[PDB]
From a paper:
The enzyme, encoded by the pabC gene, is labeled as PabC. Chorismate is first converted to 2-amino-2-deoxyisochorismate before production of 4-amino-4-deoxychorismate, which is then converted to PABA and pyruvate by PabC. PABA is required for the biosynthesis of folic acid and by extension also of essential metabolites such as thymidylate and methionine. The absence of the enzyme in humans and its essentiality in various microbes suggests that inhibition of PabC offers the possibility of new therapies targeting a range of microbial infections and structural studies provide useful data to assess the potential of this protein for such early stage drug discovery.
We describe the construction of an efficient bacterial recombinant expression system, enzyme purification and crystallization protocols, and report the high-resolution crystal structure of PabC from P. aeruginosa (PaPabC). In the crystal structure two polypeptide chains, labelled A and chain B together constitute the asymmetric unit in PaPabC, and the crystals have an estimated bulk solvent content of 45%. The polypeptide chains form a dimer and such oligomerization is required to create the enzyme active site. The PaPabC subunit is constructed from two domains. The active site is formed in a cleft formed between the two domains. The PLP cofactor is covalently bound to Lys140 that is in domain II. The PLP phosphate accepts hydrogen bonds donated by a cluster of main chain amide groups from Val200, Met201 and Ser237, and the side chain of Arg46. Tyr92 from the partner subunit forms a hydrogen bond to PLP O3. Given the importance of such complexes we judged it important to get such data and attempted to determine structures of PaPabC in complex with a number of compounds, for example, the sample used for structure determination was crystallized in the presence of 10 mM PABA. However, we have been unable to identify electron density compatible with binding of any such ligand in the substrate-binding pocket.
Author numbering:
A (entry chain B), B (entry chain A): 2 to 271
The structure:
């Protein structure tokens, strides 16, 4: 399945701004029984990106179109890309821009359950996240940093990689967020300089507060990570992977990590 | 005129990685008398981008295809985008990717001669350039910082905007490079952390060195900019615009500036 602007289409104009400048946003939605999981959260992040990038998307008409696409897809993944649309001259956002809405469907990808069960080893990526507060948190199309980090390893012994910012602060994975427990306190790295504010990160923070777990969003150092009670990665496709190792560091699978897995599995079928 | 992979075509797959992640490079070439101006500088930049991003482009063949496209165009602008090509999974560059080669032709941009003759006033952009040494200097497709900066003004009284880095260093324009002259030295801001290494900037550094002007590449502060003897912007399309003002700062059109304009006029059809 591929749609452009709500009609079957597998191609778009070579003059699109999504292609020219990565001038756009994306969401990757798990689909079950014709409907997207965690729909509200995916929509909330897309809408906030459209606000901050001033892309005149009608997010209300989009929810309809997306719902119809997911019903046609039935089961798997729906990737939505919104671009600012056709480019006139150069960088200037055009005045009367019409955003392109591209929907592409795929099968559930093959995330191994053993990563959820036994946990994973992170690759210590050397590619750093640049600090850019105007784009921080948004799931925009400028993803060359993730492409470069992903390319640093190709083996099966590492399921994800650790991305630090240019001050070596601990930020996130290559395609997932990282959270850690420091004193029975659940700590999420602050994403106001770089990173992607994950839908699962937002979901788990709210669920942990629901159960009385003390939270903090703040800067986290490498030294703090090495001494953490437990560590895990999350995203809206695999849910939670406990982190067991990073270079010489090891961590056991933690109690809070297991409690949240059990909540995600029973409540939402992760 | 629009070609994809050397064949007339106005569309590309919605699954392309240039659209998904801005996983690619571009060159905007001025076409004069049936040929791309500064062709070897554009291809050197594109080649070095392909090396640093590991995009397996046959640059020798691309040269032939570009030459044929520019002869068909005759005069105007040929924009080349090269993308890593079709996207199988997520961020990982695919194993056996075939890059896409997109060529689009346009009329010359319409620039007032007054900008060349008398110079321009710069807008003082608030958008900063983040520091990412892996991407620095390359004319890659992750250009949302240029989109946001260009969005800061829409009036005809500012021809360009000055972009600083996140530590307030003077780096470049939104779509052109900045150079200064101090006590007879042509000084270029250092582009090792961010910015695009312009083909006109490279041309002018080599021209100035060729006539015995000493060069320096280094970090430039706002205070140093303010006390420069001459300031100008440069790019492959407009050539050179003397910088006459930035907020309250004022500069005359300088002697080395006008010498280099005369070279561009006499030697490169400007
Ligand atoms: C999507 C993404 C995340 C987190 O995603 P969710 O699926 O929204 O929880 C984290 N990092 C990067 C780089 C991403 O692209
Ligand atoms: C292209 C570009 C330049 C300079 O370009 P040339 O045309 O190569 O001389 C400077 N800055 C940005 C952001 C650019 O895109
Ligand atoms: Cl081919
Ligand atoms: Cl003025
Ligand atoms: Cl610092």
């Amino acid at each position: 399945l591929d749609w452009v602007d709500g009609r079957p289409a597998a191609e778009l104009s070579v003059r699109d701004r999504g292609l020219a400048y990565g001038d756009g946003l994306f969401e990757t939605l798990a689909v079950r029984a014709g409907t997207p999981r965690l729909l509200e959260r995916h929509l909330a992040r897309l809408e906030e990106g459209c606000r901050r990038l001033a892309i005149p998307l009608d997010t209300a008409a989009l929810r309809q179109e997306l719902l119809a696409f997911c019903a046609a897809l039935g089961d798997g993944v729906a990737k939505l890309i919104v671009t600012r649309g056709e480019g006139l001259r150069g960088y200037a956002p055009p005045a009367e821009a019409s955003p392109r809405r591209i929907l592409s469907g795929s099968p559930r990808p093959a995330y191994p359950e053993r990563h959820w069960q036994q946990g994973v080893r992170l690759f210590a990526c050397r590619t750093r996240l640049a600090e850019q507060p105007l784009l921080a948190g948004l799931k925009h199309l400028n993803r060359l940093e993730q492409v470069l980090a992903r390319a640093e390893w190709s083996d099966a012994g590492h399921a994800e990689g650790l991305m630090l910012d240019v001050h070596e602060r601990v930020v996130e994975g290559v395609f997932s967020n990282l959270l850690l427990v420091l004193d029975g306190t659940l700590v999420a790295p602050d994403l106001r300089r770089c990173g992607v504010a994950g839908v699962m990160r937002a979901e788990l923070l709210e669920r942990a507060e629901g159960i009385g777990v003390p939270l903090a969003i703040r800067d986290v150092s490498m030294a703090e990570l090495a001494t953490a009670d437990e560590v895990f990665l999350c995203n809206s496709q695999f849910g939670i992977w406990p982190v067991r190792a990073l270079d010489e560091h090891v961590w056991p699978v933690g109690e809070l990590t297991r409690k949240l897995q059990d909540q995600l599995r029973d409540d939402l079928d992760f």
